[PDB]
Amino acid sequence: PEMVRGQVFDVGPRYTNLSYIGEGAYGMVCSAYDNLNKVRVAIKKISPFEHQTYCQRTLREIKILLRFRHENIIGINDIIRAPTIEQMKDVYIVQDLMETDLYKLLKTQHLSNDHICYFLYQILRGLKYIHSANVLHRDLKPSNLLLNTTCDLKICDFGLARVADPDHDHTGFLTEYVATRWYRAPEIMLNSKGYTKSIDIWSVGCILAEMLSNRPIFPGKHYLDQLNHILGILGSPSQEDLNCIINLKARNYLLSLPHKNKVPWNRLFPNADSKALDLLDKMLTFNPHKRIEVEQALAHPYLEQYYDPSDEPIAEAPFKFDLPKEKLKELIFEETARFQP
Ligand SMILES: [N-]=[N+]=NC[C@H]1O[C@@H](n2c(SCCC(=O)O)nc3c(N)ncnc32)[C@H](O)[C@@H]1O
HSE, CB side, 13 Å, CA atoms: give it for residue 118.
11
User: Which of ligand 1's atoms lies nearest the C-alpha of 99?
Assistant: 21
User: What is the four-CA torsion angle of 326, 44, 90, 39, rounded to 10 degrees?
Assistant: 130
DSSP string, 252-309: HHHHTSPP-PPPPHHHH-TTS-HHHHHHHHHHT-SSTTTSPPHHHHHTSGGGTTT--G
- Give the C-alpha separation, 162 to 127, whole Å: 14
Amino acid at 90: D
In this structure, the number of other CB atoms found within 10 A of the CB of residue 302 comes to 22
DSSP string, 90-107: -EEEEEE--SEEHHHHHH
CA-nearest residue for atom 26, ligand 1, is: 22
Q: Is the CB of 127 under 6 A from ligand 1?
A: no
HSE, CB side, 13 Å, CA atoms: give it for residue 105.
26
Entry resolution (Å): 1.7
Q: Is the CB of 312 under 6 A from ligand 1?
A: no
First to last CA, the chain: 17
- Binding-site residues sit at 21-29, 44
Give exposure, 67-105, as e/b (b: 16+ Cβ within 10 Å). ebebebbbebbbbbbeeeeeebebbbbbbbbbebbbeeb
Distance from the Cα of residue 208 to its chain's centroid: 13
Candidates 184, 160, 187; CA nearest to 173 is 187
* CA 135 vs CA 70, 138, 163, 222, 317: distances in Å: 14, 9, 5, 27, 11
- Give the C-alpha separation, 172 to 163, whole Å: 21
Which residues make Cβ contacts (< 8 Å) with residue 167, sequence separation at least 6? none
Which residues make Cβ contacts (< 8 Å) with residue 249, sequence separation at least 6? 172, 173, 174
Which residues make Cβ contacts (< 8 Å) with residue 122, sequence separation at least 6? 72, 152, 153
Q: What is the DSSP letter of 170?
A: B
- In the set 78, 90, 101, 139, the catalytic residue is 139
- Whether 139 is a known active-site residue: answer yes
Candidates 212, 215, 218, 236; CA nearest to 179 is 218
Which residues make Cβ contacts (< 8 Å) with residue 258, sequence separation at least 6? none
Ligand 1 centroid to Cα of residue 22, in Å, is 7
3-class secondary structure, 328: helix
- Give the C-alpha separation, 15 to 13, whole Å: 6
Q: Is the CB of 44 under 6 A from ligand 1?
A: yes
Helix axes 325-335, 52-67, angle to 10 degrees: 20
**Ligand 1 pocket test, candidate residues 44, 107, 147, most atoms within 8 A of CB:** 44
* CA 225 vs CA 22, 39, 68: distances in Å: 30, 45, 36
Cis-peptide, bond into residue 341, ω within 30° of zero:
yes
3-class secondary structure, 218: coil
Which residues make Cβ contacts (< 8 Å) with residue 5, sequence separation at least 6? 20, 28
**Ligand 1 pocket test, candidate residues 29, 105, 158, most atoms within 8 A of CB:** 29
Helix axes 113-132, 274-283, angle to 10 degrees: 30
Q: Which domains does the chain have, with CATH numbers?
A: 1-97+322-341 (3.30.200.20), 98-321 (1.10.510.10)
* CA 159 vs CA 84, 156, 202: distances in Å: 24, 9, 19
Q: Is the CB of 131 under 6 A from ligand 1?
A: no
Judge contact between 85 and 55, C-beta under 8 A: no
